[PDB]
Design a protein around this ligand. Structure first.
Ligand SMILES: CC(=O)[C@H]1CC[C@H]2[C@@H]3CC[C@H]4C[C@@H](OC(=O)CCC(=O)O)CC[C@]4(C)[C@H]3CC[C@]12C
Lengths: 219, 216
């Protein structure tokens, strides 16, 4: 197949440096530019600059002047983007694309490489249970939920009853509080199951090799 | 920078229909060379963008003739004849005529369903957290459509704006609805200063608010 193959996900503190690898194969490397694209949370897809295989030299869009450096090692077909002195604002996913000299489009995109910048150290989460505080059948249904709070880095995996409960499960996306992650999940079951029968959430944080099981006990 | 502004942000297409995305430029995309370089990408969930069509109206290799393009000078319009599940995801129009190629907007194709109101649940701080001095109140606004919902946290009646944290789930694969949690976290002392904590959900589908409370 013909593609640009990029490096793996980086986790860096501030003031570090990252060198993303964009290795081309299958196509004639010299006759296409390699373009770079920054994707930031919520922010737009922002064209960062370009690299000319022909002549070597590289063109930077103002925003990415100087700290971002476009390298290249042609024999080896790899292209490079390096960020030095990572500010916390560089957390994004970087794409390298094959730029075409005639129709000026970007047709072969790389899989992307995510830089996550943070001064947080690995931390286990705190799995709190959240049982009703006594509400009634809305219409014969109950909803419990766990609150996985305070972790780093992402991700955390949450299962109810070890995979048995899929439907009604709504694991909400991790959000941030002072460098650390806080995330929640909710499961909804018929009034008959709880408390006749046990519901539990299994919270695993591979980053710190911790699995926690908090059994939702009534209130 | 030619700023592309396209809307709507979310297009609740009804699978099978013709859908139209439109996009507009803050400049003419007409080059000295006498051509327009407006291109169209499609990015399916958690993935790389794909070239869909180039120079306003040319289908890139692969794009079935269900996709059609159009426009000139400054307004453009990508059009899908009869939508198909395979082609849902966000859509981006980038132009490569001026420097720089700006990407703007982002129109996501989502599914359309009967309006749903939210199964709003509310939960008080579990012993465990109180014992560590934290206090997290959790309101689960569940299983509803349309996607927008306005949440209010009244603590003793007086609204709170800070200490909040919302998180949504994009359209549920098998029931076309959305869900969101609102997590008002405050210190235990701020907490036991008062009784009464209530969640407020003002949504399309309802006459008056949806309120939920527990009295500490
Ligand atoms: C091979 C490759 O990488 C391709 C992919 C996208 C292409 C670039 C896209 C933007 C246009 C802008 C053009 O406009 C102008 O004539 C200048 C005036 C203006 O911008 O309005 C001049 C060349 C460039 C910069 C292109 C050069 C080659 C590129 C980089």
């Amino acid at each position: 197949q013909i593609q640009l193959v990029q490096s793996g996900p980086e986790l860096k503190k501030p003031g570090e440096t990252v060198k993303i690898s964009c290795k081309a194969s299958g196509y004639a490397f010299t006759n296409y530019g390699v373009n770079w694209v920054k994707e930031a949370p919520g922010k737009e897809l922002k064209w960062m600059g370009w690299i000319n295989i022909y002549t070597g030299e590289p063109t930077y869009v103002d925003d990415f002047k100087g700290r971002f450096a476009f390298s290249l090692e042609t024999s080896a077909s790899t292209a490079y983007l390096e960020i030095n002195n990572l500010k916390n604002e560089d957390t994004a996913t970087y794409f390298c694309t094959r730029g075409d000299y005639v129709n000026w489009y970007f047709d072969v995109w790389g899989a992307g490489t995510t830089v996550t910048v943070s001064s947080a150290k690995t931390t286990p989460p705190s799995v709190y249970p959240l049982a009703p505080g006594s509400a009634a059948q809305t219409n014969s249904m109950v909803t419990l939920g766990c609150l996985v709070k305070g972790y780093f880095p992402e991700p955390v995996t949450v299962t109810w009853n070890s995979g048995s409960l899929s439907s009604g499960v709504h694991t909400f996306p991790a959000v941030l509080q002072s460098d650390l992650y806080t995330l929640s999940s909710s499961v909804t079951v018929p009034s008959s199951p709880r408390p006749s029968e046990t519901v539990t959430c299994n919270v695993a944080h591979p980053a710190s090799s911790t699995k926690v099981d908090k059994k939702i006990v009534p209130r | 920078d030619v700023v592309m502004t396209q809307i709507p942000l979310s297009l609740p297409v009804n699978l099978g229909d013709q859908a139209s995305i439109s996009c507009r430029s803050s400049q003419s995309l007409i080059h000295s060379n006498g051509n327009t370089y407006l291109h169209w990408y499609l990015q399916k969930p958690g993935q790389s963008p794909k070239l869909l069509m180039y120079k306003v109206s040319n289908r890139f290799y692969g794009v079935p003739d269900r996709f059609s393009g159009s426009g000139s000078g400054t307004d453009f319009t990508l059009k899908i004849s009869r939508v198909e599940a395979e082609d849902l995801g966000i859509y981006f129009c980038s132009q490569s005529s001026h420097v720089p190629p700006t990407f703007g907007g982002g129109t996501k194709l989502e599914i359309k369903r009967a309006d749903a109101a939210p199964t709003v649940s509310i939960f008080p701080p579990s012993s465990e957290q109180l014992t560590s001095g934290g206090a997290s109140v959790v309101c689960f606004l569940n299983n509803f459509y349309p996607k927008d919902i306005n949440v209010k946290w009244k603590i003793d009646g007086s609204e709170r704006q800070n200490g909040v944290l919302n998180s949504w789930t994009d359209q549920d694969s098998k029931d076309s609805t959305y869900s969101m949690s609102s997590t008002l976290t405050l210190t235990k002392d701020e907490y036991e200063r008062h009784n009464s904590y209530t969640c407020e959900a003002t949504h399309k589908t309802s006459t008056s608010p949806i309120v939920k409370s527990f009295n500490r």
